[PDB]
């Protein structure tokens, strides 16, 4: 129902930065050809400082993107990659273990900045209460942007500099973000009062994304890596899998009601009620926010089941079909990792190291 209290969302912490002393290496490199990019390096230093201590807001995303871009410009003028002559140590903290990990590679710095871009977007997406349509739309967009950052990171930084940025972990992050993005669209679909069948397809897709997320969290090696984060994330995700399965079948039941298929209607409502109860069991101990959403949905599905079974038992007398005989709901993918372009002039601005003569 459109008025259902909203589920909480998961967001990711930003990684903590160590040193990246690029200045002495850059100066030494350019002196190999007068006062060696001195003002230009000062600007970049300020940009890094702003980025590594980024304000946790929307403008902060711009800060991260601009620094990321200037890092690419520097990379192209001064060889600071792995094995290259002007490479210096880059140090960041691995977020799961708290270990300092160092690499003499400017791409490692780029990677961590891109990671924090994704993490910050995950934060911004999770802040609105999502009762407003725009709140849902903007939250959805942020989650797709977060997915976009992690996906770009996974594909274009394959070295996997630390365990928190491995392919498995980044894919988990992507699928979690896409799931939360699609969930925002489910909320919107109900606020917009779309066709019940469409709401079902959208909710079914939420389940699919969350299944893939839960899948990764159930990997024992991944689970031991994350520790209690895995336990914390999995509680919500697994609960949501049965919750949105219930929501899907609630609306397939509504479609049945619209099509005057009253046997089918009871079958779907019963399935939704069974699935919701399983979510409630799984939600034991979780915050009142989760409990309030489940309570609300229990009222809706419980009332509609009763009425549907009542009407069928007294009036329509239609056979209640097994679900396996019915056409299963196909998830509708409406979200994606939104493209990141590190060298987008719109976000980076002029190459800091532009040198006419």
């Amino acid at each position: 129902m459109e008025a259902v209290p909203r589920m909480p969302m998961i967001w990711l912490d930003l990684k903590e930065a160590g040193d990246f002393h690029f200045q002495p290496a850059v100066k030494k490199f350019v002196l190999k050809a007068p006062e060696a990019y001195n003002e230009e390096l000062k600007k970049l230093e300020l940009l890094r400082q702003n980025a590594v201590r980024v304000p946790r807001d929307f403008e902060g995303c711009s800060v991260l993107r601009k620094y990321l871009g200037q890092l690419h410009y520097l990379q192209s003028r001064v060889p600071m990659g792995s094995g290259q002559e002007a490479a210096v140590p880059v140090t960041w903290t691995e977020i799961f273990s708290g270990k300092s990990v160092a690499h003499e590679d400017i791409k490692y710095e780029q990677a961590c900045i891109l990671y924090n871009l994704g993490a910050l977007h995950s934060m911004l997406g999770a802040m609105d209460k999502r009762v407003s349509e725009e709140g849902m739309k903007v939250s959805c967009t942020h989650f797709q942007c977060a997915a976009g950052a992690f996906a770009y990171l996974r594909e274009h930084f394959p070295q996997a500099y630390s365990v928190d940025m491995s392919r498995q972990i980044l894919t988990l992050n992507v699928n979690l973000m896409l799931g939360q993005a699609q969930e925002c669209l489910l909320e919107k679909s109900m606020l917009d009062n779309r066709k019940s069948f469409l709401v079902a397809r959208i909710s079914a897709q939420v389940v699919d994304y969350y299944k893939e997320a839960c899948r990764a969290l159930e990997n024992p090696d991944t689970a031991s890596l994350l520790g209690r984060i895995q336990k914390d994330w999995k509680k919500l995700v697994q609960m949501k899998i049965y919750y949105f399965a219930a929501v899907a079948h609630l609306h397939m039941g509504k479609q049945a009601e619209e099509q005057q298929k009253f046997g089918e209607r009871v079958a779907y409502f019963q399935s939704a009620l069974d699935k919701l109860n399983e979510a409630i069991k799984l939600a034991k101990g979780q915050p009142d926010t989760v409990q309030d959403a489940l309570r609300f949905t229990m009222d809706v599905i419980g009332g509609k089941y009763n009425s549907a079974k009542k009407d069928n038992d007294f009036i329509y007398h239609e056979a209640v079909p097994a679900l396996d005989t019915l056409q299963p709901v196909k998830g509708a993918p409406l979200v994606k990792p939104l493209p990141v372009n590190p060298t987008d002039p719109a976000v980076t601005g002029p190459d800091i190291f532009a040198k006419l003569v």
Partner: peptide, 17 residues
């Protein structure tokens, strides 16, 4: 909002048949 617009494209295509 250009970003939000792109992010909502698939949704709107779906609901507008």
């Amino acid at each position: 909002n250009v970003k939000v617009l792109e992010a909502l494209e698939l949704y709107n295509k779906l609901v507008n048949e």
